[PDB]
Each structure stands twice: as C-alpha cells, then as structure tokens.
RNA sequence: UCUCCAGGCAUACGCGUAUAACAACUCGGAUAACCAUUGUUAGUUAAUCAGAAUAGGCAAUAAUCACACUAUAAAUUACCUAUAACUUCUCUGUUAACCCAACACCGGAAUGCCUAAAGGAAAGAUCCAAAAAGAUAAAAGGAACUCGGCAAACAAGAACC
RNA sequence: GAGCUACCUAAAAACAAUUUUAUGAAUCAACUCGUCUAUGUGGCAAAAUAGUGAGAAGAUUUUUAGGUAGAGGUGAAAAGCCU
RNA sequence: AACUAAUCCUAGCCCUAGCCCUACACAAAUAUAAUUAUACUAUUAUAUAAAUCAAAACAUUUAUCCUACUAAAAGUAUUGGAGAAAGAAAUUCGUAAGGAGCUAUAGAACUAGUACCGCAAGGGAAAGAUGAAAGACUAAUUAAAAGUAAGAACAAGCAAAG
C-alpha cells in the first residue's frame, strides 16, 4: 500500500500484513519485441518487484517466475500557453516472465474493423 | 534583449487536424429537435 | 583567451554552495530564505 | 491621434436621490444650533485632516502624529523619506529666498 | 543480458607459450545463489536442470574454441580437428 | 545554467548520488555490504475466498439509497455498549472497576493492531 | 491619467490641410509638414 | 488468471457496455466489516481491467468505451474506504479519545510559523538522536520583522478582497 | 477560472474546451445572483413567454443553466441553423432553441393555463413546495428522464451488476473490532508475536 | 554503386527526452530535401557493470619487471585477544546526434583502447570581370626592396656586441 | 560570490620514440604555452583562424573535492587576479 | 474600391473609513546534496547603526531617519564651529461605508514574483476585447498614423510662395 505508515519492526516483530490494497496496476502491450513468456505491466512508483510477484500470486493467481523492473523518465518539454513546463509523470515499468513454461500474448481488443448541365439554378423550380 | 515566442494560438478543426485528435463522440444531453 | 564560460557545472558543487543545507547553517543564509519567501519565490533555493 | 468610432454610452445624472436633494444641510447647526457643534465635525475623512488644511510636507507630518505608530512597515518607511524629500525641498530649493 | 566495452582476450587458462595447450576436464561449482532449494522457493522449479546445461555450454565452448585459437584456427580458417573437452 | 524548478531525482548527479523513489524498506544492510531480506518486512496481501460472493462492482439502478447518517462514537456506543450496561445496572451487577467487561480497553499495549499509534496500514 | 489631451486629432488636421499640396514627407507627416507650412505662410 | 485484466471476450470491440450505479456510503455501511473486505478485491480487479482498457486505447488512438464505469468504479472504492475509515474513527475516540490516527505536535518552525508537526516512529529517545536534535522548532529574534511583514501582506490582501466584492456589487444594483 | 464563460454546450465537451480555451479572457457576463431557495423553475415545468419573438407561447423546459438564469425550452425561441455540415453537402435545416432568462417567463398554474406567479413554502409533511401567488395551488414537481439516458424502471441488470435484495441486505454487527482484526479471526489467521516499543516523535 | 576526406568507439562529468515510430508542414534549422520543429504513441530490464556489530592489543625495513643497483625529494583495511549474531536480493543509475560558450558557434572539454574493420563530404545552379584573400611556377639579375631580409626561399649554415 | 582566476590542502592521473647519461640534459610527438607575420575586425571567436614558433621526467601538465572574501583574500609585484 | 493597422470596457488596482487576531486546511514526504519510512555527525540573532547629504569646502554640528495623544502656550524659553541649524516644558483644550481616485504605456511589478536574465544574493516582463445565443460557422465598425499599393521618372536647385 502507498500513502500509509509501515509500523517500524525490529528482532522479534510480527509479520507486516496489508488487508486492502491501494496498488492498482495496468497489463500494457509491449513497445518492443518480449519473450513469449514476459508480460509488462505499469505499476505504481512505490510498489516494488517482490509486491508485485505476491501481488499477482495471491490476487489473480498467476505463478511467477521472474520480475524485472524499470523507471521511466516522463517528458517535461512541453509548455503551456504561457510557456511553463508541463510534465509528463514518471512511472515505473515492471517485465513479468511466467512460470511452468507458460505463454501470454497481448488480447487484441478493439477487434472491429445537382445536374452538371443546370448549374446553379435550383432544382425545386419546376416551370 | 528580446521578446518570447509566443505560438499566438474555423480554425480549431485545423488545429486538430494538423496535429490529430481523439474526438470522441458525445451524447447530447438535451435531444435535438 | 576566449571567455564567457566560467560556468563548469558540477551538482555536488552546486547543492553544497547554494543548497537548503548550506543556506540554513548560518542565519543570513535562512534571512535569504526568508526574503524569498516573503517575495513569493518558486524556488527558495537550488 | 485617434478617436473613438461610436458614441460613449449615455451617461445619466440623477440630480434628486437623497444626497444631491439633502446635501449641505445642517451646516449652520452652529450658529442656528446655539454652536453646540462646530460644523467641522461634521466632516467625513482620514483622522488626521478632518477640520485641518496644509501643504504636502504639513500633511505628511500630521499623518505621522496621528496613525504613525499603527502604520505599516513598508507605508512607514515611504511616509518617513517622503518628509525628508519635502524637507529638503521647501527648505533649500527653490526661486525665493 | 548486458552490453560493455572493455579489453577482448581468448585464453586457454595460460598463455600461448605455456606447453599445456589442451584440456582435459573442468570442475564447476554452482554459486549459492543457483541452488536447488533457492530456485523451488522462486517457482523455477524447471531450472533446476537447466542451470547446470548452460554453465556447461558456455564454460566449455570457450574453453574448447580457446584451445583451437591457439592452434591458429579462426572463423576464416575453421578448425580441421574437433576440439574436445568435459567438464562435471 | 543549472535547473533550479525541476525535482531533484536519483536520475540527476553523479552515479554517487542516490535516493529513493518511494519504496518502502524491506531489508538491512550489514557490513561488507550484503543485502539481508527480513521476511516479516515484506508486506503480505490477505486475499479472502470469493467463491460464492453476491456482490459485484455495480448496483441496480432501482436499489433506493439511503440517507446518510456518518457513524458516531454515540450511535457505536448505543448499538453495543448500551444493552449491556442497561442489563446490567438492572440486575445491579455494576461497577467502574469492570468496564473492561463490556468490551473496554485501558491500554492498547501488547495489541497486534493499536488504536493510537496506530501501527497497522489500511 | 486624470486628464488627457482629448483634441489632438483636429490640432494636427489644422497644421496637415495646409500641406496637403506639398511634395514628400513634408505634406504627411506632422514634425515636417509643420516648419514646411510656416515657411509658406 | 492474466484473463481478469481484461474485459468479456464478447464485449471487445463492443461501442459501449451497461454499467450499474456505483456504491453509495449507506448502502456499504450496512454491509459488515468482513464483506467489505472481499468486496473491495472485487472493485479492485475491476479497476485495474478499466485502468488496462484506458491505456490500450490510448494505444490504438481510440475513444474508450463507456469511459462512465472507471469513476463508478473510483467512486465506490473511496466509500468503502470512507466507511472503513468512520467504524475505526469511532472505536479509537471510545477506546482512547484520540481525533486522529498518528501523533503530532504543534511547533514552530525556523521560519517562525506554526506548523502541525507529525511524528515519526524511531526506535530510540529522542535526546539520544543526533539526527532529530539537527532540527530546530524554535525561531531566532531575527525573524520578529519578518512576522509582522507577513501579517501586514496577508492584511492588504484582505483588504483589496473586501473592497471589490463592494464595488461589485455596486455593478450589480445599477445593473439590477 | 475566473473568465470560464458558460454556454449551451455542456461543460467539459469538445465545443466547450475550444470555446473556453486556457488563454481566453472574455468579458464577464453579469448575472443577477438567485439564492438556490428563490429559483423557483425546473426542467418539464410549462412555462410562458412573457415577451420576445414568441411571446405568449408556452413551452417545456428541458434545459437549465443556472450559472446564467438560463431556461432552454423545447421548439420556441427558435432560429435557424444547418447541422452535420460537410465540404461535400450542406446539412440538414434544422431549428435551434435559445435560452431565455428567467424574468422573460412565468410558470404556468396546470388546471387553468395562465402564467401565474408562484411561492415557497413547507406543506404538512414539512416538505417545500412551491405555491401559486394567487390562487394558492400546489404546482408538482415535475419527473425529467435522467441526463446519462438510465431509465431505472426499464433498467434490467447484466452481469457485474449487484442484484436488488443483495444490495438492501444487512450483515453489519456492530462490535468494538476494527475490520483488520475481523477479516483475520474469520480467516483464521495466528500472530503471537507482538511489536517492540517505538518512540514515536 | 562511384569519387574523395581521415579521431573514432567507450566511460567519467554534465545535460534531461533532443531518443524511436507515426502523423503533420504553422513556428524552429539561418534555404530546400528531410527533419533536430509541432502533436500522438512508445522506450533505458542487472546478486557479476554502477551506486548506498562492540571493545582491546601492536606495527623500524618504499617504489621503479624488484633481483642485482645505488640513490634522495624518504614515499600505503591487515594480524591477533574476547564479546555478539547463527542463511540474504530489496532499492537506485542504464535512451540520444547530448555538455560549457546568447546559436545546429572553425572555440573549450578528463581517461582507456585503438588509427580506419570505426566515422565522414570541401561544390544550391552558372559564370570565369576588376579589387581583395590563398596556393604553385619564374627568363636575366640576386636585398638593388625596406624603418628593418618583414614575408617568402632549390636557404635554415658562421661569427660578433 | 574562489564551478573563472590567484594561491593552497587532500585523493588521484599522463609523458611514445631517440641520444645522453644518471639530468629543473639533448632532438622531437601527445600535451602545455603563445614568439613573429598574415587573415579577421558586428568576425567561426565580446581575443579566433591559418601558418610559424617555446617547453615537453619536471619549479611539468591535467582531473576531482575542499579552503582563504572586499577596511579583505591571493600575488616567482604585472598595483596581476578575485565569474 | 486596401494592405499594414485603428476603434473598445472591465480584469483589477488606489486612498480612506471601520475592525485586534484565533486561515495554521486531505493521506504521505521533507532540514539527509530539503521534500529520500529507522540510530551514524547532535542543536543557538545582535555590543552604540554608518555614510550620503546640509554648512555653498571641511574637521564639532546637520529636522525626519532614531514614534509616544490633539489645539494652544511657540518657533517662545533654551541649545549651537552662538554658524548652518536645532527646539521644549509648566499650563489650558478635547464625548466623534465612501470617492470633482485610475480604466490596459494608467491603476499594484503582477494574466506573474511567472517567463526570462544571473553561479548566487538578486533583477524582472509583455499581453485581453463578437453576440442574447457559436447546440446561431466567432463577429462588426474606420477618406482615418507613420509604412506601402493603386500610379517610377522627365533641364533648374531648403522644394515653397507670387
Ligand atoms: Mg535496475
Ligand atoms: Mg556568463
Ligand atoms: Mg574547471
Ligand atoms: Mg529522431
Ligand atoms: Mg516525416
Ligand atoms: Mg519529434
Ligand atoms: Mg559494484
Ligand atoms: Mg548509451
Ligand atoms: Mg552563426
Ligand atoms: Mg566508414
Ligand atoms: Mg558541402
Ligand atoms: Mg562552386
Ligand atoms: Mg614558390
Ligand atoms: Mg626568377
Ligand atoms: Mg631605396
Ligand atoms: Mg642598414
Ligand atoms: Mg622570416
Ligand atoms: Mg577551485
Ligand atoms: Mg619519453
Ligand atoms: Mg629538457
Ligand atoms: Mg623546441
Ligand atoms: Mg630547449
Ligand atoms: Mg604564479
Ligand atoms: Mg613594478
Ligand atoms: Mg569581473
Ligand atoms: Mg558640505
Ligand atoms: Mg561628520
Ligand atoms: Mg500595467
Ligand atoms: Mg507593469
Ligand atoms: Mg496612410
Ligand atoms: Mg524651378
């Protein structure tokens, strides 16, 4: 979860449970060519490749083998009207490889596929 | 010294024209008659 | 010689020289602070 | 020059609403009131020049006298070099000596 | 995998003018980090066989094409004997 | 001609300079630098079974609402504390020194989830 | 400004009728055609 | 499965889809602490499939379809989290009377104004930190003449704001 | 924003952000301000043109922006304008509605067609109800279809739609236990450890 | 494909999306083509490259292929004694024709490897006037030029105040 | 305000080939400097270009971080340098 | 027979009056190279304001600056290179929302302490204009500035005057 205190734990300490999740994340099509088995996603900035291996797991069920994880910088060289910087944010870009030999391809959604001899003089004059 | 290049923005259909837009279409709250 | 760069720029000089930290460690630096504060700066220092 | 291409919109005077019609009124409660009250304190205006008249430099010490202490610092500071500008001026420049 | 620039070198584990020029066998251990127990813990459980594949692969065909550079065969002049080594 | 507006990140300055974009903690640093993960500092998500649940993420159109009434520290009191204590003063089994028979609690130490601190996340 | 010089247009129109008959700068343009006008009078 | 970030196999490609009525606070409240628990999951997997469409548009250069269900969505996720948020509000007044969940203080800051202060978990005393006793909340008399340049700036906004709210309305009553 | 001018477009459509752009600086419009209590007419309330090209005419409301005082009523007040304009063809005629403020109309009494001046004022229950000026006359509030286009009475729920009954059902106990501690003794989760002390400041 | 030129590839520092595709053809490139421009969408993936327990006790003998060899400017945590803990991989940097000089500036810019296998194009078309700038050749003479052998030379040697 | 420049502190770098010797020696690159002439003079450049030149194992040159501040600092003294 | 242009009215502002204030606003982050979830290295204004300037130089001195109620006593007593200048008191008196202000080169610098300039302290802009409705296709109004075009010039000269 991101916007909430983690109780600080020392030797001994019990285990840091999180009933309701505030990460929400996207399955994204790749920009270039993946493995058939890796998966990308667009996750919150503060989640790490450890949430998301276990969020995955436990929420959709999905087995995991592998996350690689990336931050992308987000553009600022757009300016308003009156030319002030307008940023783009940056995000965090997170490479899922499946387990038991699994594959994944990115769905295709979106699958849908007068008389020229009387010029000017209008037509409904019937004299 | 100098003076800002302001881009100084019938014509908005040009303006998106030239750069594209997603133009999603819209239901008219109040039915035409 | 040909001038007009004397600016080499380096970030450890530059936030050590100008930063929060520095301004703050004497107090005319935080009435430097305070003056931009008061003048409504968007950036109280580098 | 240039000049405007349409006529200002009319501009109305209403010379009976109850200021204009009742204007000037009890200004003799002196001397018709038995001068119970002088009509200078019948005036409306900064504390520091009401039943009071002077020049520029008079005016901005007299300002100082009466508000100076709950003064702004920037206005303070303003008021106090506008003296010393008036000072100098009427006090040493000038045609007649 | 990742890219760098730094020195080339082909090397047998001594230099050309050693008289030991051929190998016999190569021992490997696999780091701690490699582990059975580590990679049934991460879900790849499959791996197990296939990190011993590759470390043999690539230890053993550089080490045998080591071996043929310094008998003086190259992409343009291919080797005219097998190279051969083991490796456990 | 340094940027004086934009957020200084771990991206900017040399390769020394580095800082965090957020992420929580979940590991220590020993000496001679070797990364130990702490098991109970890796959050864990509890995730209940859905298996025959009725609610979806939307409602019917023809559901009326209800008019809000926010909850109270009275109305909690009412619903679950009252009975008991009415009974009870009744039967005259009743005293200050056993509040904590209706449910109170002097001291939120040695609770897994206090209160105030609170030591728990949503 | 409390008090602007409103007039100004028909101040040059005076100056500019005697000049209209001028050749160059001096039949326009009110620095110029002003002297030019003087001298005719 | 990776299928639950995506919509109906059917409904792709569809011009719209219908949606419900979100979630209101007085519906939720009647449900009970451990229904809320799964129905949050349930709003969430939903949202992450319509946080997945809206990025896949984007992508096709595409209008979203039925862009009404991802606030729907937002909207019923924060009243479960409202309603959650009131039952622990009430159980902490009862139990410890606390109006809020993390301690704080008031201090004043170096720059001599007061600003709510909120504490950090630590795991030794704070007279043994070197680290916390760096930071001052305290104001040095230096600082007094900038205090009253505040007060007077703040003072002349306030006072240019009243006065053209008079003058408007002048524009008003002549108008009308 | 200040200079937001508001329209007959809806705020926040393709026509809206190109007739209020971020840099425009239009003059603002004076509106009389009407207390939400004063305003007294409603989408689907007959009203009458007191004057203009259509005068004494009455018409339904369908439309309202009250930024403006403005009542839009159906098929009145109508000028002339050609829609889905191409390069290739002309459009099609159609008539354009124009809104008209509040002090050009009146409401209308429902028994006797007149525009009758009305007045708030509570009823028996305690619910506010607007009254004829004379001949004092409850004027109901009238029923407008809903601007999202839901009719909830022909609604019929697909899948990822709550049921009814399932939605009205009570299961809240009220307890002195934080959803956390619920959801783990249901879910039969055990934690015996217990966290040290922190110094919170 | 041809003709010709000869500091290129990495890292550090710096910069901060200029990266790539598409669509545009207003602004930007000192002109066109085309885009370095405008809009939209994408991108840089690391346990090896790179970044970020306590208390005592004690040290004579450089480097340079370190041997010989001398020298002078005299020159780089370890090892022990006790205590404590008793299986770990998260986080962050990673794009480009790039930076400092108001500019797509003939300037400035550290290190390793290598010297053409890498990287590049001096001419928009035409015309061959003067004056101006640069390169090459010189009959006979050889400083007569000039403030002065300045500049140039098939010279670059010798001496003296 | 010492990211230029003057000087300093700490931690680091670079110097081929050839001859002498055993070196603030020699020839001459990289590198540092800027002698003389021409071009340029709103120029490529608010001090450059092209040639020609001086040093080039040292009082050499270069890199990074730190220090000294205007009644002052620094100075192999040019009243030089301190954006 | 028109290009470049021009016209415009309200965005706000100004001075007073009145008035102590209790605006200090979600979660999270931040004094670490601020805005980086936890130890390391702990944290702290200032001894008298000076000079310009006046004294036609300058060297003691030079109103306000460096505030203690109004009107009078009074520019009086006093003080001073007795020069320039400075200047009391005793005592008496005292019960109270507006504009012959600005209207886009004006009024605040302000559409903004932004863009941009500067290593930094710091300096610091420019501008808008349809209508009731744009779900009426975003209008009109003007021989009107300099500048041009329509339409190069035709012995001889402060360019005009008779
Ligand atoms: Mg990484
Ligand atoms: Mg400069
Ligand atoms: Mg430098
Ligand atoms: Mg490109
Ligand atoms: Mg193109
Ligand atoms: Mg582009
Ligand atoms: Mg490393
Ligand atoms: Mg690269
Ligand atoms: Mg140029
Ligand atoms: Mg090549
Ligand atoms: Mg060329
Ligand atoms: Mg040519
Ligand atoms: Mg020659
Ligand atoms: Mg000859
Ligand atoms: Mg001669
Ligand atoms: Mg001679
Ligand atoms: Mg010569
Ligand atoms: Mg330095
Ligand atoms: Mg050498
Ligand atoms: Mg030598
Ligand atoms: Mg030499
Ligand atoms: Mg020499
Ligand atoms: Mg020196
Ligand atoms: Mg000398
Ligand atoms: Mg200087
Ligand atoms: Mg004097
Ligand atoms: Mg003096
Ligand atoms: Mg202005
Ligand atoms: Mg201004
Ligand atoms: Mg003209
Ligand atoms: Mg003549």
Sequence with gaps: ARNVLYPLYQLGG?????????????????????????????????????????????????????????????????????????????????????????????????????????????????? | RFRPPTPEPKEFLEYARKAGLVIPQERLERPIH | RARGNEYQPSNIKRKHKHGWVRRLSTPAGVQVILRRMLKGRKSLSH | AFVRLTLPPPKVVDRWNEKRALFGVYDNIGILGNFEKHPKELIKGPVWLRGWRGNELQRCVRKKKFVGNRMFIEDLHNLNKRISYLYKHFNRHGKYR | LFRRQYENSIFTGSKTADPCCYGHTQFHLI?????????????????????????????????????????????????????????? | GADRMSKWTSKRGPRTFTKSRGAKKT?????????????????????????????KPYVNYRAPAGIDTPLTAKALFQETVAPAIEKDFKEGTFDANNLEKYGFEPTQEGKLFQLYPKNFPR | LRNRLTDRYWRVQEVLKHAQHFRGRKNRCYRLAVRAVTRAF | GLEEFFDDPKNWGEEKVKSGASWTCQQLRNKSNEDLHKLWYVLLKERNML?????????????????????????????????????????????????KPRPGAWRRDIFGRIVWHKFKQWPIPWYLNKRYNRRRFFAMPYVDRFIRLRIEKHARIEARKRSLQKKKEKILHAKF | ????????????????????????????????????????????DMVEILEGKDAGKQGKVVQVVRQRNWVVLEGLNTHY????????????????????????????????????????????????????????????????????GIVPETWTDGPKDTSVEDALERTYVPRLKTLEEDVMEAMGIQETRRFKKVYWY
């Design chain 8, 51 to 99: 946080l997945t469409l809206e990025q896949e548009a984007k992508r096709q250069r595409l209008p979203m379809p039925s862009p009404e269900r991802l606030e729907k969505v937002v909207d019923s996720m924060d009243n479960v989290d409202k309603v959650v948020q009131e039952r622990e509000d009430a159980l902490r007044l009862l139990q410890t009377g606390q109006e």
């Design chain 5, 31 to 88: 780091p701690d980090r490699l582990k059975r127990e580590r990679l049934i813990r991460q879900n790849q459980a499959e791996q197990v066989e296939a990190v011993f594949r590759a470390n043999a692969i690539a230890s053993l065909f550089a080490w045998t094409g080591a071996q043929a550079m310094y008998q003086g065969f190259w992409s343009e002049a291919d080797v005219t004997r097998p190279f051969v080594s083991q490796a456990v």
């Design chain 1, 14 to 127: 019990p285990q840091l449970r999180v009933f309701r999740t505030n990460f929400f994340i996207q399955l994204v099509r790749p920009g270039t060519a993946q493995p058939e088995d890796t998966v990308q996603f667009r996750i919150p900035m503060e989640m790490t490749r450890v949430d998301l291996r276990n969020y995955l797991e436990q929420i959709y069920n999905v087995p995991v083998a592998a996350v690689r994880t990336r931050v992308q910088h987000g553009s600022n060289r757009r300016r308003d009207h009156k030319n002030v910087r307008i940023k783009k944010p940056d995000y965090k870009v997170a490479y899922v490889q499946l387990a038991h030999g699994q594959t994944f391809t990115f769905p295709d959604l979106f699958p849908e596929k007068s008389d020229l001899r009387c010029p000017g003089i209008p037509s409904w004059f019937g004299l």
């Design chain 6, 27 to 55: 590991g220590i640093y020993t000496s001679d630098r070797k990364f130990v993960q702490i098991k109970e500092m890796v959050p864990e998500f509890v995730v209940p079974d859905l298996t025959g649940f009725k609610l």
């Design chain 9, 81 to 148: 304008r050609y829609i889905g304009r191409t390069k290739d063809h002309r459009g099609t005629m159609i008539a354009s509605e124009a809104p008209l403020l509040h002090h050009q109309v009146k409401l209308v009494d429902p028994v006797d067609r007149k525009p009758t001046e009305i007045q708030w004022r509570f009823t028996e229950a305690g619910e506010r109800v607007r009254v004829s000026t004379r001949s004092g006359r409850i004027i109901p509030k009238p029923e407008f279809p809903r601007a999202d």
């Design chain 9, 1 to 44: 924003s200040p200079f937001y001018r508001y329209g007959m477009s809806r705020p926040g459509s393709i026509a809206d952000k190109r007739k209020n752009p971020p840099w425009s600086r239009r003059r603002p419009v004076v509106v009389e301000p009407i207390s939400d209590e004063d305003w007294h007419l409603f989408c689907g």
